[PDB]
Design an enzyme around this catalytic site. Sequence first.
Site, PDB file in Angstrom:
ATOM      1  N   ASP A   1      10.293 -15.648 -49.631  1.00 52.18           N
ATOM      2  CA  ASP A   1      10.854 -16.752 -50.240  1.00 52.18           C
ATOM      3  C   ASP A   1      11.405 -16.412 -51.553  1.00 52.18           C
ATOM      4  O   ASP A   1      10.392 -16.410 -52.647  1.00 52.18           O
ATOM      5  CB  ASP A   1       9.798 -17.870 -50.413  1.00 52.18           C
ATOM      6  CG  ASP A   1      10.481 -19.158 -50.989  1.00 52.18           C
ATOM      7  OD1 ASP A   1      11.617 -19.105 -51.097  1.00 52.18           O
ATOM      8  OD2 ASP A   1       9.430 -19.959 -51.228  1.00 52.18           O
TER       9      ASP A   1
ATOM     10  N   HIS B   1      -7.419 -43.470 -27.470  1.00 50.24           N
ATOM     11  CA  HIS B   1      -7.373 -44.726 -26.564  1.00 50.24           C
ATOM     12  C   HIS B   1      -8.898 -45.188 -27.117  1.00 50.24           C
ATOM     13  O   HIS B   1      -9.742 -44.620 -27.945  1.00 50.24           O
ATOM     14  CB  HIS B   1      -7.776 -44.107 -25.135  1.00 50.24           C
ATOM     15  CG  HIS B   1      -8.766 -43.226 -25.121  1.00 50.24           C
ATOM     16  ND1 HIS B   1     -10.280 -43.541 -25.253  1.00 50.24           N
ATOM     17  CD2 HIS B   1      -8.795 -41.794 -25.033  1.00 50.24           C
ATOM     18  CE1 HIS B   1     -10.880 -42.449 -25.105  1.00 50.24           C
ATOM     19  NE2 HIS B   1     -10.166 -41.267 -25.083  1.00 50.24           N
TER      20      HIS B   1
ATOM     21  N   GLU C   1      -5.556 -35.631 -21.582  1.00 50.60           N
ATOM     22  CA  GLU C   1      -6.400 -34.848 -22.315  1.00 50.60           C
ATOM     23  C   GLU C   1      -6.875 -33.520 -21.691  1.00 50.60           C
ATOM     24  O   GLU C   1      -6.325 -33.238 -20.807  1.00 50.60           O
ATOM     25  CB  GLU C   1      -8.153 -35.647 -22.206  1.00 50.60           C
ATOM     26  CG  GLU C   1      -9.148 -35.022 -22.955  1.00 50.60           C
ATOM     27  CD  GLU C   1      -8.975 -34.449 -24.327  1.00 50.60           C
ATOM     28  OE1 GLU C   1      -8.037 -33.887 -24.783  1.00 50.60           O
ATOM     29  OE2 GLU C   1      -9.981 -34.917 -25.168  1.00 50.60           O
TER      30      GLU C   1
ATOM     31  N   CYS D   1      23.205 -26.439 -50.178  1.00 54.23           N
ATOM     32  CA  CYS D   1      23.428 -28.144 -50.479  1.00 54.23           C
ATOM     33  C   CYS D   1      24.133 -28.453 -51.493  1.00 54.23           C
ATOM     34  O   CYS D   1      23.898 -27.946 -52.867  1.00 54.23           O
ATOM     35  CB  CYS D   1      21.799 -28.776 -50.940  1.00 54.23           C
ATOM     36  SG  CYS D   1      21.748 -30.382 -51.140  1.00 54.23           S
TER      37      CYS D   1
HETATM   38  N1  LIG Z   1      18.069 -27.980 -45.816  1.00 52.56           N
HETATM   39  C1  LIG Z   1      17.674 -28.507 -47.201  1.00 52.56           C
HETATM   40  N2  LIG Z   1      18.594 -28.893 -48.011  1.00 52.56           N
HETATM   41  C2  LIG Z   1      18.162 -29.251 -49.334  1.00 52.56           C
HETATM   42  N3  LIG Z   1      16.828 -29.702 -49.468  1.00 52.56           N
HETATM   43  C3  LIG Z   1      15.983 -29.604 -48.671  1.00 52.56           C
HETATM   44  C4  LIG Z   1      16.301 -29.037 -47.179  1.00 52.56           C
HETATM   45  N4  LIG Z   1      14.980 -28.903 -46.581  1.00 52.56           N
HETATM   46  C5  LIG Z   1      14.453 -29.512 -47.547  1.00 52.56           C
HETATM   47  N5  LIG Z   1      14.698 -29.853 -48.464  1.00 52.56           N
HETATM   48  C6  LIG Z   1      14.049 -30.624 -49.724  1.00 52.56           C
HETATM   49  O1  LIG Z   1      13.743 -29.581 -50.849  1.00 52.56           O
HETATM   50  C7  LIG Z   1      12.594 -29.999 -51.607  1.00 52.56           C
HETATM   51  C8  LIG Z   1      11.574 -28.575 -51.445  1.00 52.56           C
HETATM   52  O2  LIG Z   1      12.382 -27.800 -52.529  1.00 52.56           O
HETATM   53  P1  LIG Z   1      11.951 -26.274 -52.567  1.00 52.56           P
HETATM   54  O3  LIG Z   1      11.681 -25.833 -51.222  1.00 52.56           O
HETATM   55  O4  LIG Z   1      10.951 -26.074 -53.778  1.00 52.56           O
HETATM   56  O5  LIG Z   1      13.187 -25.443 -52.953  1.00 52.56           O
HETATM   57  P2  LIG Z   1      13.385 -24.076 -53.532  1.00 52.56           P
HETATM   58  O6  LIG Z   1      12.573 -23.266 -53.092  1.00 52.56           O
HETATM   59  O7  LIG Z   1      14.745 -23.908 -52.857  1.00 52.56           O
HETATM   60  O8  LIG Z   1      13.593 -23.844 -54.965  1.00 52.56           O
HETATM   61  C9  LIG Z   1      11.873 -31.045 -50.625  1.00 52.56           C
HETATM   62  O9  LIG Z   1      12.038 -32.301 -51.571  1.00 52.56           O
HETATM   63  C10 LIG Z   1      12.785 -31.232 -49.357  1.00 52.56           C
HETATM   64  O10 LIG Z   1      12.865 -32.496 -49.058  1.00 52.56           O
HETATM   65  O1  LIG Z   2      13.916 -16.013 -56.606  1.00 50.34           O
HETATM   66  C1  LIG Z   2      14.048 -16.531 -57.741  1.00 50.34           C
HETATM   67  O2  LIG Z   2      14.755 -16.218 -58.408  1.00 50.34           O
HETATM   68  C2  LIG Z   2      13.309 -17.951 -58.049  1.00 50.34           C
HETATM   69  N1  LIG Z   2      11.750 -17.976 -57.831  1.00 50.34           N
HETATM   70  C3  LIG Z   2      11.511 -17.802 -56.193  1.00 50.34           C
HETATM   71  C4  LIG Z   2      11.492 -18.935 -55.248  1.00 50.34           C
HETATM   72  N2  LIG Z   2      11.066 -20.427 -55.804  1.00 50.34           N
HETATM   73  C5  LIG Z   2      12.215 -21.402 -55.908  1.00 50.34           C
HETATM   74  C6  LIG Z   2      13.434 -20.945 -56.612  1.00 50.34           C
HETATM   75  O3  LIG Z   2      13.248 -21.304 -57.684  1.00 50.34           O
HETATM   76  O4  LIG Z   2      14.564 -20.622 -56.065  1.00 50.34           O
HETATM   77  C7  LIG Z   2       9.832 -20.622 -55.185  1.00 50.34           C
HETATM   78  C8  LIG Z   2       8.769 -20.927 -56.400  1.00 50.34           C
HETATM   79  O5  LIG Z   2       8.828 -20.112 -57.667  1.00 50.34           O
HETATM   80  O6  LIG Z   2       7.776 -21.435 -55.965  1.00 50.34           O
HETATM   81  C9  LIG Z   2      11.343 -17.001 -58.564  1.00 50.34           C
HETATM   82  C10 LIG Z   2      10.528 -17.348 -59.657  1.00 50.34           C
HETATM   83  O7  LIG Z   2      10.651 -18.685 -59.953  1.00 50.34           O
HETATM   84  O8  LIG Z   2      10.221 -16.904 -60.718  1.00 50.34           O
HETATM   85  O1  LIG Z   3     -13.359 -30.262 -27.095  1.00 54.39           O
HETATM   86  P1  LIG Z   3     -14.578 -31.157 -26.795  1.00 54.39           P
HETATM   87  O2  LIG Z   3     -15.144 -31.179 -28.275  1.00 54.39           O
HETATM   88  O3  LIG Z   3     -15.579 -30.614 -26.084  1.00 54.39           O
HETATM   89  O4  LIG Z   3     -14.296 -32.725 -26.284  1.00 54.39           O
HETATM   90  C1  LIG Z   3     -13.469 -32.556 -25.143  1.00 54.39           C
HETATM   91  C2  LIG Z   3     -13.701 -33.911 -24.607  1.00 54.39           C
HETATM   92  O5  LIG Z   3     -13.482 -35.071 -25.348  1.00 54.39           O
HETATM   93  C3  LIG Z   3     -13.318 -36.047 -24.309  1.00 54.39           C
HETATM   94  O6  LIG Z   3     -11.970 -36.636 -24.817  1.00 54.39           O
HETATM   95  C4  LIG Z   3     -14.480 -37.250 -24.573  1.00 54.39           C
HETATM   96  O7  LIG Z   3     -14.501 -37.934 -25.710  1.00 54.39           O
HETATM   97  C5  LIG Z   3     -13.421 -35.449 -23.154  1.00 54.39           C
HETATM   98  O8  LIG Z   3     -12.475 -36.178 -22.134  1.00 54.39           O
HETATM   99  C6  LIG Z   3     -13.011 -33.807 -23.085  1.00 54.39           C
HETATM  100  O9  LIG Z   3     -13.523 -33.097 -22.311  1.00 54.39           O
END
Ligand SMILES: Nc1ncnc2c1ncn2[C@@H]1O[C@H](COP(=O)(O)OP(=O)(O)O)[C@@H](O)[C@H]1O
Ligand SMILES: O=C(O)CN(CCN(CC(=O)O)CC(=O)O)CC(=O)O
Ligand SMILES: O=P(O)(O)OC[C@H]1O[C@](O)(CO)[C@@H](O)[C@@H]1O
Length: 451
Positions: free
Chosen positions: A120, A249, A318, A150
Amino acid sequence: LELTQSRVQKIWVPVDHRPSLPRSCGPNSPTVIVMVGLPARGKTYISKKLTRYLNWIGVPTKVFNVGEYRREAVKQYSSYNFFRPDNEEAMKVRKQCALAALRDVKSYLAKEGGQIAVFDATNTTRERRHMILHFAKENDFKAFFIESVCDDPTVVASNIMEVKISSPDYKDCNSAEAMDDFMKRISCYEASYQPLDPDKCDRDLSLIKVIDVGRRFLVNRVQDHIQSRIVYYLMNIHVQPRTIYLCRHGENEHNLQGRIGGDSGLSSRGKKFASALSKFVEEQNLKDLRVWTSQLKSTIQTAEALRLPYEQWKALNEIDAGVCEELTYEEIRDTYPEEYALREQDKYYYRYPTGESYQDLVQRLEPVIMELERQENVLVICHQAVLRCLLAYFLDKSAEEMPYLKCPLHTVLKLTPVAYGCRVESIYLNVESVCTHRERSNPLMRRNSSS
Ligand SMILES: Nc1ncnc2c1ncn2[C@@H]1O[C@H](COP(=O)(O)OP(=O)(O)O)[C@@H](O)[C@H]1O
Ligand SMILES: O=C(O)CN(CCN(CC(=O)O)CC(=O)O)CC(=O)O
Ligand SMILES: O=P(O)(O)OC[C@H]1O[C@](O)(CO)[C@@H](O)[C@@H]1O
């Protein structure tokens, strides 16, 4: 031919009478998922969620967030000046963070049993991507790129408000200054940003470009089944907030008798719960609410009380206890002492004779999880083991803890999106019932004592 059935998982394997000196060997090329895109584009959100999904279906995955390495190497953030392309020192430190993360990626995939590593970082220049590709090639790792694009200012703004301002980088800023700082920060990357070009420069790269928050996708050369599943998943999740309610349930007659499995009907209390649930749903005042049940009577009777349309999924039935269906745990212990003990020692992998394990449940529930991702407000009425599995997915709980999560009768688990994950609120509907939860509960064997 001469095979033996493993005691826990019940898998037939060839008997291997080991020779005098048994040999080992030690122990599907691992993959590096390369996130791409400007900041505040959902790269970290996608990294964490996809990882949550892959680990749940059993593919060991881990996120390597270069930002966390940076925050580790610099201690406290002050301003976007740190991200200026003309900041020589910082550029050096950021590159070192990237290489340190790749170092860990290598160790994870080649030595720790990891299969997917999510790298990432912005990786916005062809040069940085070329480096990662080189690292992948020399280590025999595959590389799959996920680029999020985006250009909707409203979305960017919203993303900054949801996860950036409350970030530890901004612990010393109010919302406005944090917002202003982050925008300047984003602009730092814009000059050198080279988006993926599958129709030319990146023709040979395996990638998916996510556009307009999942409105449009560009997919180029998927190489195997794992990349296949990743693309399918990415194309079916959305960000619009919604609520998922999970509950069992209402209490049934087998619960009263301490018997597992079966298809018994609601007890008088279970019916009281069903009414309470209707009252509860009504009070949530949701525009639309989809209701799902298993095909077992107890969940269906419960849903009937809601006076809402519902859909039955056999996949939500289940866990099948095989030859132990209809028995009490006491009868299982007495009649099948060995099976009882084996399950207690390895509750996630253990499979009942002619029945299932929690592992089988997960595979069975994959389609339910995928469809749940596509939905908005949904209430799932199921059973103990099934609920534990779905809860493990939403809350990123491990296979080891999954079979022991607490999912009591007559209690709704309300899940809502918060930042990078899901928040859980428990709401007990005040109707008594038994408790079906059961916690985890030598001497003579030593002298004296593919695509
Ligand atoms: N495909 C997407 N395009 C734009 N925003 C997105 C997408 N998927 C998730 N998000 C939004 O991005 C946010 C998280 O951003 P983040 O992952 O920190 O961005 P980045 O890591 O690129 O800096 C959340 O609010 C989420 O709703
Ligand atoms: O790769 C980059 O330049 C940005 N981030 C890595 C990715 N980031 C999101 C972003 O800023 O693109 C994730 C995070 O820092 O949590 C590094 C940094 O903040 O030093
Ligand atoms: O994974 P566990 O803890 O044995 O519980 C399983 C059980 O739970 C139940 O839903 C009973 O609460 C059973 O029908 C099922 O076998």
